[PDB]
Amino acid sequence: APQALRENILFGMGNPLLDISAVVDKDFLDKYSLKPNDQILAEDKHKELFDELVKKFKVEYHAGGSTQNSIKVAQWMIQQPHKAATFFGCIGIDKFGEILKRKAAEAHVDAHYYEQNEQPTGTCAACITGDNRSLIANLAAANCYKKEKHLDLEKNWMLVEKARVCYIAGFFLTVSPESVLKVAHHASENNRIFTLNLSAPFISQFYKESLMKVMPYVDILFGNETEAATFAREQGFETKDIKEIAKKTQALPKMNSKRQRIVIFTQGRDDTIMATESEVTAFAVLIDTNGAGDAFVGGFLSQLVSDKPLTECIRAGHYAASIIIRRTGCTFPEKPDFH
Amino acid sequence: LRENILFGMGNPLLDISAVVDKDFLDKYSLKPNDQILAEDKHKELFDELVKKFKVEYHAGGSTQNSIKVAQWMIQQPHKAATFFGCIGIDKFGEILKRKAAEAHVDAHYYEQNEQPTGTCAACITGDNRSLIANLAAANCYKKEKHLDLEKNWMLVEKARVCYIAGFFLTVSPESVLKVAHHASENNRIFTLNLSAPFISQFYKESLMKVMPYVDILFGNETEAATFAREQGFETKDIKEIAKKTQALPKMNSKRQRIVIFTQGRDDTIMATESEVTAFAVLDQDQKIDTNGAGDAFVGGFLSQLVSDKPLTECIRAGHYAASIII
Numbered sequence: 172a173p174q175a176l177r178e179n180i181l182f183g184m185g186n187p188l189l190d191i192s193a194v195v196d197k198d199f200l201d202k203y204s205l206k207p208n209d210q211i212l213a214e215d216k217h218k219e220l221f222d223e224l225v226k227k228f229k230v231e232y233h234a235g236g237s238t239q240n241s242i243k244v245a246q247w248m249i250q251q252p253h254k255a256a257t258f259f260g261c262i263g264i265d266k267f268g269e270i271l272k273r274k275a276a277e278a279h280v281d282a283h284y285y286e287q288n289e290q291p292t293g294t295c296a297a298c299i300t301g302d303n304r305s306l307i308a309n310l311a312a313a314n315c316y317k318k319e320k321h322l323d324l325e326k327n328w329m330l331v332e333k334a335r336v337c338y339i340a341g342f343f344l345t346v347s348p349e350s351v352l353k354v355a356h357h358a359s360e361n362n363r364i365f366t367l368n369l370s371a372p373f374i375s376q377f378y379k380e381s382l383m384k385v386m387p388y389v390d391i392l393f394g395n396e397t398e399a400a401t402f403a404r405e406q407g408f409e410t411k412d413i414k415e416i417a418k419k420t421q422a423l424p425k426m427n428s429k430r431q432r433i434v435i436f437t438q439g440r441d442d443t444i445m446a447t448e449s450e451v452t453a454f455a456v457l458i459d460t461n462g463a464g465d466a467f468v469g470g471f472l473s474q475l476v477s478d479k480p481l482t483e484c485i486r487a488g489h490y491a492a493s494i495i496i497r498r499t500g501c502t503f504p505e506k507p508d509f510h
Numbered sequence: 511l512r513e514n515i516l517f518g519m520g521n522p523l524l525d526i527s528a529v530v531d532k533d534f535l536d537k538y539s540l541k542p543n544d545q546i547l548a549e550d551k552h553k554e555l556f557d558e559l560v561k562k563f564k565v566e567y568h569a570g571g572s573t574q575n576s577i578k579v580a581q582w583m584i585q586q587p588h589k590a591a592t593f594f595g596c597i598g599i600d601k602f603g604e605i606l607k608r609k610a611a612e613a614h615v616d617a618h619y620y621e622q623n624e625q626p627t628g629t630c631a632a633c634i635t636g637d638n639r640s641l642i643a644n645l646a647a648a649n650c651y652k653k654e655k656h657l658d659l660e661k662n663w664m665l666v667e668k669a670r671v672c673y674i675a676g677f678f679l680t681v682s683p684e685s686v687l688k689v690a691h692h693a694s695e696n697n698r699i700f701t702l703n704l705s706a707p708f709i710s711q712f713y714k715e716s717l718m719k720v721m722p723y724v725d726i727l728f729g730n731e732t733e734a735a736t737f738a739r740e741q742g743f744e745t746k747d748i749k750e751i752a753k754k755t756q757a758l759p760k761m762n763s764k765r766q767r768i769v770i771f772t773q774g775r776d777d778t779i780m781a782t783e784s785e786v787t788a789f790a791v792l793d794q795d796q797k798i799d800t801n802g803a804g805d806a807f808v809g810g811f812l813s814q815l816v817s818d819k820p821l822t823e824c825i826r827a828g829h830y831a832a833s834i835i836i
């Protein structure tokens with residue numbers, strides 16, 4: 172028989188961040204030795220950057236966090252019911268905290284946060300030049316999430332049990348790999364679909380212990396082309412061809428053998444590459460590329476909760492990425508127009 | 511070393527060896543130097559060997575050999591090493607049980623009656639050995655009938671080092687992946703052997719499923735060459751194949767993979783994270799069962815690795831165990 176949506180069908184958890192964006196200049200990038208299109212975790216030498224950004228530029232504020240973006244876009248495309256998509260994560264008790272709570276509610280997402288006083292809500296600097304964005308994430312509160320404090324409490328765990336599809340960005344592996352593995356194991360032992368993002372090169376470089384521990388449980392791996400290339404370089408694939416990286420990544424040991432792994436790499440304007448059990452194939456597309464990537468996954472997830480074909484999941488991803496790309500931030504004044 | 515510190519599973523075989531002649535090789539279209547699984551065209555071969563040649567009988571199976579040599583070099587305690595596998599309830603079965611116990615190995619076999627205990631025919635001509643395995647009972651091993659039962663699975667949990675020959679990938683890749691993944695989860699060392707060229711040629715989907723879990727890969731030079739060819743490595747140099755094999759996807763990043771290729775009386779090649787280095791074989795005999803020497807090398811190596819001795823002392827112990835068995 173045919174599957175059909177209902178509340179808490181999609182589960183996501185990750186770092187809830189408030190994004191602080193501003194058009195900067197090449198000098199500001201060098202002052203902090205930042206590259207134009209990069210995504211890094213805030214080091215201690217970057218502490219000055221967050222004050223200087225707000226002080227010296229005209230900044231904007233938008234709700235962010237990669238998984239959180241994908242879960243809002245998934246909920247939008249799903250449309251009905253409200254709260255089809257669940258989000259968990261940790262924030263501070265502060266102004267930025269409350270903006271985030273409000274934005275998940277306006278997105279009709281069933282958000283359940285772990286809140287605490289010690290750390291302010293996490294923020295992410297987006298320093299823009301041309302069509303480049305240089306992201307620096309200051310996780311703060313987001314880095315305080317603990318399974319025992321939140322995910323394990325039975326009120327919250329119940330909602331993960333409702334889920335048919337789980338999505339967690341690789342980014343969250345820097346904070347609570349124990350939480351990611353508990354959802355991962357659960358998905359495996361109850362034949363639910365578990366899905367992950369490579370998220371950023373630094374995850375494959377510096378967080379591969381958590382990444383490769385979870386990979387055997389990953390039903391669908393998403394990512395973009397530099398992430399794939401960093402992953403291939405780091406895991407000794409001895410190739411640069413995206414299609415060959417998708418194929419070797421697809422064939423990695425897998426726990427739940429009742430589902431073959433699917434691997435999807437988006438490529439900006441280049442074609443989106445999908446590796447299944449039996450082939451690797453390109454799909455052409457038809458500027459926040461980072462956000463477009465998150466929206467692609469939200470589009471894809473939006474159809475995967477219904478068990479639609481993989482082609483239709485890809486086409487929905489491409490559709491959500493083109494829409495959200497034009498409107499900055501996570502609001503949706505229009506309704507999806509996808510058939 | 512406590513009891514059950516080293517875990518092994520594989521195909522328990524009784525080896526039936528004899529010096530044969532060229533006619534026998536030709537009759538069964540055998541490679542003078544090879545290791546194959548018995549196909550239908552080989553059914554008659556095992557009877558004809560026993561009947562027409564002067565055969566000898568020894569307890570065998572690659573992993574089983576390595577585990578016995580490991581227990582011997584470890585010495586204490588008795589039952590430092592565990593072995594799982596499947597046999598028949600028959601004469602050859604009982605010889606194997608007896609030999610493991612005399613070896614002080616904690617062998618927990620799955621015994622059943624539909625298939626006889628597996629045998630391996632070693633057909634010698636000159637310095638050539640042509641091995642043909644009739645796995646039989648060995649091939650009946652099933653995780654659900656044995657490995658999964660909690661009294662056996664408990665013994666795998668005791669293990670700090672696991673060793674499985676790639677041979678066992680033809681039989682139960684499900685069992686190998688369960689031990690493999692378990693070692694990874696609990697940062698226990700998981701080790702595997704390339705075992706023979708036919709593993710890479712015909713079971714590479716299973717081989718490459720498990721390779722990410724392999725903390726130490728062992729093998730000889732032809733296995734390394736077959737592996738590089740089948741993996742499209744391009745290079746044929748043993749030191750280079752060791753290096754690219756070392757750098758392959760790895761699921762437990764707490765341990766950098768080590769790759770050891772033996773090469774007969776040539777040097778043993780070892781590739782770690784940061785270098786590849788040759789270690790010579792000092793003590794030379796004339797005349798040799800390289801296959802059995804290879805198994806013994808791994809037993810020697812494992813014997814020191816359960817104590818967390820340096821890699822150089824593991825290798826020296828391997829070279830030492832090989833020269834004894836020769």
Ligand SMILES: C#Cc1cn([C@@H]2O[C@H](CO)[C@@H](O)[C@H]2O)c2ncnc(N)c12
Nearest residue numbers: 186188211235236237295308342461462
């Ligand atoms: C760096 C970085 C990050 C950027 N992002 C998100 O990338 C989104 C654009 O796709 C931004 O909204 C930012 O919050 C992260 N989300 C969770 N954890 C992270 N470490 C990051």
Ligand SMILES: C#Cc1cn([C@@H]2O[C@H](CO)[C@@H](O)[C@H]2O)c2ncnc(N)c12
Nearest residue numbers: 521545546570571572630643677801802
């Ligand atoms: C062929 C072969 C095999 C040879 N051997 C063993 O290799 C030892 C020589 O090192 C012999 O004792 C043979 O039984 C195998 N053991 C497990 N599975 C196998 N398929 C084989």
Ligand SMILES: C#Cc1cn([C@@H]2O[C@H](CO)[C@@H](O)[C@H]2O)c2ncnc(N)c12
Nearest residue numbers: 772774775793794795798803804829832
């Ligand atoms: C052939 C052979 C030899 C193998 N070995 C040992 O057995 C291992 C398995 O091939 C070799 O790496 C070596 O340690 C020898 N040791 C001393 N003299 C030898 N001729 C050999």
Ligand SMILES: [Mg+2]
Nearest residue numbers: 185186238340
């Ligand atoms: Mg996230």
Ligand SMILES: [Mg+2]
Nearest residue numbers: 370461464465
């Ligand atoms: Mg992205």
Ligand SMILES: [Mg+2]
Nearest residue numbers: 520521573675
């Ligand atoms: Mg074996």
Ligand SMILES: [Mg+2]
Nearest residue numbers: 705801804805
């Ligand atoms: Mg060998």
